[PDB]
Amino acid sequence: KTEQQIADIVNRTITPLMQEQAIPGMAVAVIYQGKPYYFTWGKADIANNHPVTQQTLFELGSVSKTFNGVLGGDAIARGEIKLSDPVTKYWPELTGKQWQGIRLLHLATYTAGGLPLQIPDDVRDKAALLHFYQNWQPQWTPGAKRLYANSSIGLFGALAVKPSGMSYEEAMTRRVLQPLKLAHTWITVPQNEQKDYAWGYREGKPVHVSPGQLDAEAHGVKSSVIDMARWVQANMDASHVQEKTLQQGIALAQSRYWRIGDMYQGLGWEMLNWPLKADSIINGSDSKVALAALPAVEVNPPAPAVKASWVHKTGSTGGFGSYVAFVPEKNLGIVMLANKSYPNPVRVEAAWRILEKLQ
């Protein structure tokens, strides 16, 4: 209930997590009764002894897919695209017969038929990207199986913005970031903000890898703890969001498009019915399960966003580990940002422990 109790609950979980996982720096935001509480620990840059602050930028990895889903939802609300539209409507160059029957819905929800996890490192331009998709051989018919893939949701983001006439980063900045006042959220970090951009660590060493094709769409957002708290607030309850297409896009990203066991696939967001057993989300986050091709069950028509849900997303990069989770029915949420990638089951367990103790 009190700020001191919230602080005690958060510190009791995060301090031993950082010690056990050898995390150099972390920033956490808790949304409790719709209000944000911010916490920072450790170092953004070990060698220069820079501390984590409320302005520190962390790489979100796959949490970037939530921004992709919402921008896609906003495009639907504008009347620019429809999830039922064929992929070929936005990329007429994809003449391959295997692309007939594949819709934007399938790209957004990993159900196109076995698109690969990543874009190959040698595919470095649009013609090479076209050749890659043109020669891709599906494993299953569209809608049969869900197989998590950056080449799937990455292409959804790229195509969703085509009617806008803007690049993906520009459409994301104008349509999502600026209206929600996310002033410390970037895809390309400007030179003047490099001083706040944390270093990611792997095996005790600073790591940096240049971005590849579709990185912005699938995995390229960087954000601060304050903006991530604002992102969770807006996604939990968009009633204050003045821009209607964005309010509607947020709601569309939490619609239930497919059922995969106990999980429901949204646009970027993944949801489970609330209340639930902690083991479902913890075991569910293990990469062996998360990356598995599993039968997908279409929800006809998509079920509108359910308030009684555990809505979440994990994400990592070579040097970062992030996790966001929220329960709209309880006006309760958490953001966990770290400059070391650590096991997903460990993130989910720590988030569950904090949110269980707060409720």
Of the candidates 179, 172, 224, the one whose C-alpha atom is nearest the C-alpha of residue 36 is 224
Pairing mode, strands 297-303 and 309-317: unpaired
CA distances from 98 to 118, 145, 146, 210 (A): 19, 16, 17, 32
The amino acid at residue 219 is H
The answer to whether 107 and 159 have CB atoms below 8 angstroms apart is: yes
Report the alpha-carbon distance of residue 208 to residue 197 in Å, rounded: 12
**Four-CA torsion 246, 249, 250, 255, nearest 10 degrees:** 170
C-alpha distances in Å from residue 293, one per residue of 54, 100, 146, 246: 38, 21, 6, 32
Task: Kindly report the backbone phi and psi dihedral angles of residue 18, in degrees, each rounded to the nearest multiple of 5, phi listed first.
Answer: -60, -40
Question: CB neighbours of 279 closer than 8 A, spacing ≥ 6?
Answer: none
Residue type, 203: E
Write out the chain in H/E/C secondary structure: CCHHHHHHHHHHHHHHHHHHHCCCEEEEEEEECCEEEEEEEEEEECCCCEECCCCCEEECHHHHHHHHHHHHHHHHHHCCCCCCCEHHHCCCCCCCHHHCCCEHHHHHHCCCCCCCCCCCCCCCCHHHHHHHHHCCCCCCCCCCEECCCHHHHHHHHHHHCHHHCCCHHHHHHHHHHCCCCCCCEECCCCHHHHHHECCEEECCEEECCCCCCCHHHHHCCEECHHHHHHHHHHHHCCCCCCCHHHHHHHHHHCCEEEEECCEEECCCCEEEECCCCHHHHHHHCCHHHHCCCEECEEEEEEECCCCCEEEEEEEEECCEEEEEEEEHHHCEEEEEEECECCCHHHHHHHHHHHHHHHC
The answer for residues whose C-beta is within 8 angstroms of residue 218's C-beta and 6 or more apart is 62, 64, 65, 68, 150, 153, 154, 157
Q: Residues 62, 151, 255, 341: which is the catalytic one?
A: 62
- Strand 200-202 versus strand 263-265 pairing type: unpaired
Residue showing tokens 């950082």: 18
Domains of the chain: 1-359 (3.40.710.10)
> Treating both helix axes as pointing N-terminal to C-terminal, what angle do 244-253 and 64-78 enclose, rounded to 10 degrees?
120
Residues forming a β-bridge with 230: none
151 is catalytic: no
116/62 Cα distance (integer angstroms): 15
Cα separation, 16 vs 69, in Å, equals 34
Residue 223 pairs in a beta bridge with 58, 185
**Residue 303 CB neighbour total at 10 angstroms:** 14
CA dihedral 337, 340, 341, 343 (to 10 degrees): -90
CA dihedral for 42, 46, 52, 56, sign (positive or negative): negative
Residues 6 or more apart whose Cβ sits within 8 Å of residue 52: 25, 26, 27, 40, 41, 42, 43, 44, 198, 339
CA 76 to chain centre: 19
Q: Which of 244, 251, 241, 222 is nearest to 181 (CA)?
A: 241
How open is the CA angle 91-164-217, to the nearest 5 degrees? 65
User: What token pair was written down for 31?
Assistant: 């949304």
Q: Which residues contact 7 (CB under 8 A, 6 or more apart)?
A: 37, 39
Amino acid at 9: I
Question: What residues does 314 pair with on adjacent strands?
Answer: 323
The amino acid present at 68, given as its one-letter code, is N
Resolution in A: 1.6
Distance CA 271, CA 256 (A): 8
Per the CB < 8 A criterion, the answer to whether 244 and 94 are in contact is no
Look at strands 145-146 and 58-59 and give their pairing.
unpaired
Q: What is the dihedral of CA 339, 337, 257, 81, to 10 degrees?
A: -80
CA–CA distance, 138 with 330 (Å, rounded to integer): 41
Let me know if 22 is exposed, middle or buried by CB neighbors in 10 A (0-12, 13-18, 19+).
exposed
